[PDB]
DNA sequence: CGGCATACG
DNA sequence: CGTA
DNA sequence: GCCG
């Protein structure tokens, strides 16, 4: 049977029930801008359980026994086998209140409680934002300025002319320490919408301040249009022939003892690893974060050397980045 | 009924 | 709140 | 919305 848990199954970034999938993430996107988080982590959970099909879903008998399908989720797929449309689909589809909803929450530095205030305030278009520049902060302002090239989609030209400016700044920084592509690249997608690296040394404790060194290393190069630590999230000016462009930057550096739990933290997918830390602490009574794995009752933490010893000792089959696509 | 992942900036 |  |  197919696995509850996202965790529990492989998921490639290629499927075979794509219209299925993405009706039901509308759906639990419009959950989202409602405040329905529950309801917005079902219908995820349920357009995953299709991504790890084998094949096409054809006719509505292939649903029964599927975790996460219950009347809803089913009479989505219903529909669109029926009729190739879901009438509550194509209604929050062509709702102004959803479309101003993903225009805004699309911005860097506004997320659904920011959008839907400025949706109650009759904001309908960038412009309008830009119209009243007090009501923002300094990194929405940002967002703002960036959005277009920040709507381009980044290709693997750019991640790898990105990560030869960061693993210069990092070496110049620290020598020994290292750059890991993490986040969707690293699962296998050729495209995405920002870049992530993981920056590590495997001395403990010698990464110690390394992140704004970093920063102003990549500054005093002029690469840095935005940022502000562990996290830094960035807009870079990426150099083009004859131009630039801007492109979203994640930096993250962690102590080796806890890279093995940061790489499989950052490398995602996110439902992935929501699944993966609810697994953890629902079946297996372990504690999971981007830092370690604790055990809440002997109070100790255990010690991975890879993301491999993690799944081994949650009790997982390993899955490779490529099938963690939930 | 109530949970739904769990951090940092 | 925002970010991941 | 689904489920433990
Ligand atoms: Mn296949
Ligand atoms: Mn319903
Ligand atoms: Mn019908
Ligand atoms: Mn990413
Ligand atoms: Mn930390
Ligand atoms: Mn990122
Ligand atoms: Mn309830
Ligand atoms: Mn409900
Ligand atoms: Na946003």
Redesign the pocket.
């Given at each position: 049977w197919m696995p509850?848990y996202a965790c529990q199954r492989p998921t490639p970034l290629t499927h075979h029930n794509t219209g299925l999938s993405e009706a039901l993430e509308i759906l639990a996107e419009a959950?989202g801008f409602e405040g329905?988080?529950?309801?917005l982590?079902?219908?995820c959970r349920?357009a995953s359980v299709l991504k790890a099909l084998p094949s096409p879903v054809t006719t509505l008998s292939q649903l029964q026994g599927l975790?996460?399908?219950?009347?809803?989720?089913?009479r989505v797929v219903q529909e669109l086998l029926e009729h190739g449309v879901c009438e509550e689909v194509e209604r929050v589809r062509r709702s102004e209140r959803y479309q101003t909803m993903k225009l805004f929450?699309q911005?860097?530095?506004?997320?659904?409680?920011?959008?839907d205030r400025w949706y109650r305030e009759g904001l309908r278009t960038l412009d309008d934002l830009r119209e009243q520049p007090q009501k923002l902060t300094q990194?929405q302002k940002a967002?703002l300025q960036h959005h277009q090239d920040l709507s381009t989609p980044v290709l693997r030209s750019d991640v790898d002319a990105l990560q030869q400016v960061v693993e210069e700044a990092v070496g110049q920084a620290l020598p020994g320490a290292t750059v890991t592509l993490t986040?969707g690249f690293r699962r296998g997608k050729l495209q995405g919408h920002?870049v992530?690296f993981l920056i590590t040394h495997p001395k403990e404790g010698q990464e110690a301040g390394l992140l704004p060194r970093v920063m102003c290393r990549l500054q005093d190069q002029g690469l840095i249009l935005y940022h502000?630590?562990?996290?830094?999230?960035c807009i870079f000016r990426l150099p083009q022939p004859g131009s630039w462009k801007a492109v979203?930057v994640?930096l993250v550096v962690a102590p080796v003892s806890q890279f093995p739990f940061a790489l499989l933290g950052?490398t995602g997918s996110?439902l992935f690893?929501?699944?993966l830390?609810?697994f953890?602490?629902?079946e297996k009574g372990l504690?999971?974060?981007?830092?370690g794995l604790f055990d809440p009752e002997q109070k100790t933490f255990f010690q991975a050397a890879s993301e491999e010893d993690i799944f081994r000792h949650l009790g997982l089959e390993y899955l490779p980045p490529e099938q963690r696509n939930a």
């Open positions: 509850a959950a329905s988080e529950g309801r982590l079902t219908f349920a975790p996460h399908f219950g009347e809803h989720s089913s929450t911005i860097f530095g506004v997320g659904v409680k920011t959008a990194q967002g986040g920002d992530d502000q630590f562990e996290r830094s999230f979203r994640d950052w996110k690893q929501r699944e830390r609810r953890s602490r629902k504690w999971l974060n981007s830092h």
